[PDB]
């Protein structure tokens, strides 16, 4: 546009595909990372079904679709279907050719080595990308919120990651990975829903569970005191008319499921709560470096949007943590797009040149170019 | 009634062939367990011997220099 | 007629477990021969490595004396 | 048995509970020092779960158990569970009453003072022990191997201890303690395993990591030369069929983790390598007392069993150590039970009488009897 | 059945006679080991059609009708349900438990119910399971030849136990804890 040339920003997860044009502050066309076929055989003739039904077109009509998700936190059940997800991204919504503008993707911390080389194969050899990089999830948001000294816990629907990044990344481990977010809460509901004459059976309607979840469901401050309150039918049940037509008086259902977050013992996992793992990462660093970590805590992700998420942390942490200085948690009121706001940062930096992979660089160091320069 | 007699003639044949195979299969598995035990044992020694000669040649190289 | 089905069904179970056992047993028997050959091969190499490092032991010794 | 009366030998650590009958040369019934409950709620009725699942019975079935270890190198997370570990030792395997035979336990060098009095409370006041002593880990093995003049470095899964004991114990410090062994290597694997589509998540299966570790994993002589060798897929990957059914081609995974031993910089600790700390202890003693220390080095413990453990020491030591006399390291081909063989020694000595604590001695000098006579 | 029966000039319309469909079903209908190999066998009119004189009087030569319907069991895709087969859901439940607790589960599998009485029900499981399941130890499925009354035989057990006292609800217990007594003590 008579400014520069070849530039773009992108970001994908287990919820939405955040992307936009060149030099933007916020996304432009986010869409669900879904994709399925036809369990209904799509009037076979009222088109040769194909196109699994990805994008707004897919999210619009769920019934015909057997929504089979490709990338469940880390593991990619299949790469063949990924081919026609990015074919919908750059060409339909972004309206730009990938054989021109760079690309800034996100990296699920500690992702299988074999996956990186596989992805690069899809871009460089097929979609011809002469410049691109895959930054590491959390570290991005750090520079956006305006923090240089804090501990980041960025996670939404993908995977939980405790990234203590306030003066260095890639160093002692002090990081954790937990497959317990988003889809885990989306699949657990139908189970407990059975006791209330409800059952979102198939995957298509399972996706709706998440929709209603993010508009009412809240977290209990103390399950004990709210157990006796159950008698008082006022703060619990609330009339929610299902778009089609079937009221669901969610009440105790709201604060029962989220309890699993702090208590992973409800789904057969010894994984400690997100406030225990926090200790595990802090106890590794030096002794004279905790007082500043407690001062500011970066809690990001769409998972940190439900009522009663930050106040609970300040109750459990103080217990098994030093009690002398003040403790404050920085949870950006809109901390979901924290990664994208940070993506816009690195997207406009020139120092970033010493990170991405140039067309020729791949052929000069084989497929291992990724893990030979990056880390 | 006649078919009831014929069907039994084929049953005993498969049972014996299965038992005869299981007898040898178990023996082969037991033998394999013994062989694989010595396999890694010899491999460990082979690796050790390889480590020895490497250190010897290194020391001998030094002895030669000091000798000259 | 029903008794026939019972025995006929057993014949299917017997035939199934027979061909399956013999199939794997034959594969195992063939594998043992390969592993046994590898054992004999590795053992031979280990013998060559053992006698070699021993030759260095007497070589590094005599050289140490000449150096002294 | 028409010989003597009241005698026994024992030894516990962060791996196995080594113990036997009276006057034995080798242990008789070793078992893992584990203990957990039921994350599965044990068919609550197909017995009132209780018995955490300790001993062979526990090690047999790991799934139902949430193996929560009590004594992590020095610190005892909880003493209440220790009650029913010794209740399984003397009564089930040893088949002898503790109210008769003495007991010879081991002492983790420099163990909290408050712990000694607490232990004695469990024996004398409850299990009624009229005679017992808690000897100091390393010094025991010295008399077994047949050495009077050497430096001992005894450690397995518990804690690393550099004990220069060749003519006197308890004197200048010249000793070190490092919480970096066994369980440290057992927990670090799952982290790096994530990059290879593997993840031993919970603690139950974490224990297996140690099992496979001690049958293949080896140490690299020189990481640099073995980095290029990676291309040659022959000395690296090896088919290991997981008992259940999931092959794991460990290769570069074998010599990557053990490197942490010599390089504690991979887990955020300024602790110097085991060959640097060796210098730290030698430089304290007199100048004319080193030539004999280098002549013989006592390297004991199950940690000194992996391939490439002794030869590496002779490479790094000679560098920052005097280069004139000959240097030889004595690493008993089976140097794990070195403590027990030494335990059998002190167990048959009568001079040992002037060490242990008699029933009455405790009441005549209060609870401080331990740190009033012993040291 | 009545649905697919329409193509063979038969139709058990109302619910009354619908109940009979189940009666004849449990005396002949079997499950196909492999639909592909049994598709060509259809030409050989010998293992398929079998004369079944309807008590009233109307012969029904069931043949391909026998192993077509049961296929829906393993393939719930024939009735518009994304529900995975009974051998997939098995994985879903096993993958949740610990890793070192599967080798013993495969050793013994309790398949009970009258649904596990049809010909070709246990052998098929040992074909599909081994595929997406660990292949090292031996796998055996325990399907009691009469596994329908398994619940009743077990009922006789708990019926003679005294420990069962700490489970049931006594007359007074209901009035002392209101109607919620059930979900207050039980679970
Ligand atoms: N205000 C909100 N309240 C509750 N959930 C929200 C809110 N905003 C976004 N979400 C949810 O957060 C998820 C996306 O979070 P994100 O951190 O981007 O996930 P991921 O990185 O795993 O793709 C979606 O399920 C979305 O519905
Ligand atoms: N031959 C061996 N190779 C590798 N590891 C071994 C060997 N023998 C024993 N071990 C391991 O050594 C550990 C026990 O060592 P030990 O020195 O007794 O520990 P601790 O004193 O901390 O209890 C266990 O983890 C055990 O599996
Ligand atoms: Ca993500
Ligand atoms: Ca110890």
Instruction: State whether residue D185 is helix, strand or coil.
Output: helix
- The rounded distance, in Å, linking the Cα atoms of E85 and D162 is 60
CATH number for the domain harbouring residue E35: 3.90.640.10
Inspect the structure and tell me whether chains C and D have 3 or more CB pairs less than 8 Å apart.
no
Residues D218 and D233 occupy one common structural domain: yes
Q: Tell which of D248, D267, D286 closes a domain.
A: D267
Query: Measured between CB atoms, does E96 come within 8 Å of chain A?
Result: yes
For chain A, first and last CA: distance in Å? 35
Deposited experimental method: cryo-EM
Interhelix angle for D183-193 vs D203-213, to 10°?
100
Q: Tell which of D267, D296, D322 closes a domain.
A: D267
**CA separation, residue E164 to residues D50, E157, E168 (Å):** 20, 10, 7
Neighbours of chain B (3+ CB pairs under 8 A): C, D
Element (H, E) at B29: helix B2-67
Inspect the structure and tell me whether chains B and A have 3 or more CB pairs less than 8 Å apart.
no
- The rounded distance, in Å, linking the Cα atoms of D167 and B22 is 63
Nearest partner of D167 among D148, D152, D154, judged by Cα: D148
- The rounded distance, in Å, linking the Cα atoms of A245 and E123 is 45
* Cα E19 → chain centroid: 18
Residues A262 and A307 occupy one common structural domain: no
Q: Test B28 with C25 for CB contact under 8 angstroms.
A: yes
- The domain in which residue D142 lies consists of 136-181+271-332
Residues D206 and D244 occupy one common structural domain: yes
Residues 6+ apart with CB under 8 A from B3: C4
* Cα A171 → chain centroid: 24
Residues A286 and A164 occupy one common structural domain: yes
Instruction: State whether residue D256 is helix, strand or coil.
Output: coil
| Given resolution (angstroms) | 7.7
Q: Test A270 with D201 for CB contact under 8 angstroms.
A: yes
Find the farthest-apart pair of alpha carbons in chain A and give their distance in angstroms, rounded.
72
- The rounded distance, in Å, linking the Cα atoms of A259 and D253 is 38
- The rounded distance, in Å, linking the Cα atoms of D347 and E165 is 54
- The rounded distance, in Å, linking the Cα atoms of D272 and A222 is 46
Please provide the DSSP assignment of A314-356 as one string: HHHTTTSS--SS---EE--TT-STHHHHHHHHHHS-SGGGGTS
D chain contacts of residue A268, beta-carbon cutoff 8 Å? 39-40
Q: Test D202 with A269 for CB contact under 8 angstroms.
A: yes
Given a contact cutoff of 8 angstroms between Cβ atoms, the answer to whether D356 and D102 are in contact is yes
- The rounded distance, in Å, linking the Cα atoms of E81 and A270 is 33
Nearest partner of A299 among A138, A93, A100, judged by Cα: A138
Given a contact cutoff of 8 angstroms between Cβ atoms, the answer to whether D271 and D178 are in contact is yes
Query: Measured between CB atoms, does D196 come within 8 Å of chain A?
Result: yes
Q: How far is E181 from chain D (nearest CA, A)?
A: 20
Give residue A205's region: left, alpha or beta (phi > 0; psi -120 to 50). alpha
Within 6 Å (CB) of ligand 2, which residues are found?
D 13-16, 156-158, 182, 210, 214, 301-302, 305-306, 336
The dihedral built from the CA positions of residue E105, E107, E108 and E109, taken in this order, carries a sign that is positive
Residues 6+ apart with CB under 8 A from D84: D35, D51, D52, D54
CB atoms within 10 A of CB B13: 13
Residues D21 and D157 occupy one common structural domain: no
Given a contact cutoff of 8 angstroms between Cβ atoms, the answer to whether D143 and D300 are in contact is no
Q: Test A172 with D267 for CB contact under 8 angstroms.
A: yes
Chain C, 22 to 51: residues with Cβ < 8 Å from chain B are: 22, 24-25, 28-29, 31-32, 35-36, 38-39, 42-43, 45-46, 49-50
- The rounded distance, in Å, linking the Cα atoms of D21 and C51 is 44
- The rounded distance, in Å, linking the Cα atoms of A33 and A11 is 11
D chain contacts of residue A265, beta-carbon cutoff 8 Å? 39
Q: How far is C65 from chain B (nearest CA, A)?
A: 10
Question: For residue D295, what are its two tokens?
Answer: 């002549």
- The rounded distance, in Å, linking the Cα atoms of D291 and D282 is 11
Nearest CA residue ID for atom 16, ligand 1: A156
Residues A282 and A259 occupy one common structural domain: no
Question: For residue E185, what are its two tokens?
Answer: 């003590």
CA-CA-CA-CA dihedral for D118, D119, D124, D130, to nearest 10: -140
CATH number for the domain harbouring residue D26: 3.30.420.40
Q: Tell which of A68, A85, A118 closes a domain.
A: A68
Domain count within chain D: 4
Q: Which atom of ligand 2 is nearest to the CA of D334?
A: 1
Residues A208 and A263 occupy one common structural domain: yes
Residues A88 and A62 occupy one common structural domain: no
- The rounded distance, in Å, linking the Cα atoms of D307 and E125 is 45
Residue to substitute from B44, B51, B62, interface D, most D β-carbons within 10 A: B51
Q: Which residues surround ligand 4, an ion (CB under 5 A)?
A: D 13, 158
Residues 6+ apart with CB under 8 A from E40: none
Specify the pairing of strand D297-300 against strand D329-330. parallel
Element (H, E) at E126: helix E125-128
CATH number for the domain harbouring residue D47: 2.30.36.70
Residues A85 and A105 occupy one common structural domain: yes
Question: For residue A361, what are its two tokens?
Answer: 């660089």
Q: Which atom of ligand 1 is nearest to the CA of A158?
A: 22
Ligand 2 centroid to Cα of residue D27, in Å, is: 14
CB atoms within 10 A of CB E104: 13
Residues D24 and D75 occupy one common structural domain: yes
Comparing CB atoms, the residue among E103, E133, E163 nearest residue D45 is E163
Nearest partner of A152 among A316, A331, A23, A288, judged by Cα: A331
Residues D260 and D310 occupy one common structural domain: no
Residues D94 and D121 occupy one common structural domain: yes
- The rounded distance, in Å, linking the Cα atoms of A184 and A305 is 17
- The rounded distance, in Å, linking the Cα atoms of C31 and C13 is 27
Q: Test D202 with A173 for CB contact under 8 angstroms.
A: no
**CA separation, residue A279 to residues A273, A274, A321, D22, D305 (Å):** 10, 9, 8, 46, 34
């Amino acid at each position: 546009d008579e400014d520069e040339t070849t530039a773009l920003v992108c970001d994908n997860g287990s919820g939405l595909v955040k992307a936009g044009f060149a030099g933007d502050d916020a996304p432009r066309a986010v869409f669900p990372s879904i994709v399925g076929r036809p369990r209904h055989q799509g009037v076979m003739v009222g088109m040769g079904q194909k196109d699994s039904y990805v994008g707004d077109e897919a999210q619009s009509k769920r019934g015909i679709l057997t929504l089979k998700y490709p990338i469940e936190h880390g593991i990619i059940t299949n790469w063949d279907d990924m081919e026609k997800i990015w074919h919908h991204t750059f060409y339909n919504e972004l309206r730009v050719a990938p054989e021109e503008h760079p690309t800034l993707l996100t990296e699920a911390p500690l992702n299988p080595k074999a996956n990186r080389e596989k992805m690069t194969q899809i871009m460089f050899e097929t979609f011809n990308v002469p410049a691109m990089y895959v930054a590491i999830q959390a570290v991005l948001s750090l520079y956006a919120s305006g923090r240089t000294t804090g501990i980041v816990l960025d996670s939404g629907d993908g995977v939980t990651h405790n990234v203590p990044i306030y003066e260095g990344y890639a160093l002692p481990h002090a990081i954790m990975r937990l497959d317990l977010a988003g889809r885990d809460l989306t699949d657990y509901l139908m189970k407990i829903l059975t006791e209330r004459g409800y059952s979102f059976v198939t995957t298509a309607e399972r996706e709706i569970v998440r929709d209603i979840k993010e508009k009412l469901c809240y977290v209990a401050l103390d399950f004990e005191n709210e157990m006796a309150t159950a008698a008082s039918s006022s703060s619990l049940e609330k009339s929610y008319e299902l778009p089609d037509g079937q009221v669901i008086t969610i009440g105790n259902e709201r604060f029962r499921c989220p309890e699993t977050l702090f208590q992973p013992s409800f789904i057969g996992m010894e994984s400690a709560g997100i406030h225990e793992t926090t200790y595990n990462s802090i106890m590794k660093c030096d002794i004279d470096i905790r007082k500043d970590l407690y001062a500011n805590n970066v809690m990001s992700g769409g998972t940190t949007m439900y009522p009663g998420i930050a106040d609970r942390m300040q109750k459990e942490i103080t217990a098994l943590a030093p009690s002398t200085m003040k403790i404050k948690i920085i949870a950006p009121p809109e901390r979901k797009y924290s990664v994208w706001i940070g993506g816009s940062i690195l997207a406009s930096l020139s120092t970033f040149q010493q990170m991405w992979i140039t067309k020729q660089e791949y052929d000069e160091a084989g497929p291992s170019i990724v893990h030979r320069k990056c880390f | 009634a006649r078919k009831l007699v014929i069907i039994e003639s084929d049953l005993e044949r498969a049972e014996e062939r299965a038992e005869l195979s299981e007898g040898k299969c178990a023996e082969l598995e037991e033998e394999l367990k013994t062989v694989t035990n010595n396999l890694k044992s010899l491999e460990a020694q082979a690796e050790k011997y390889s480590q020895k000669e490497d250190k010897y040649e290194e020391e001998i190289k030094v002895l030669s220099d000091k000798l000259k």
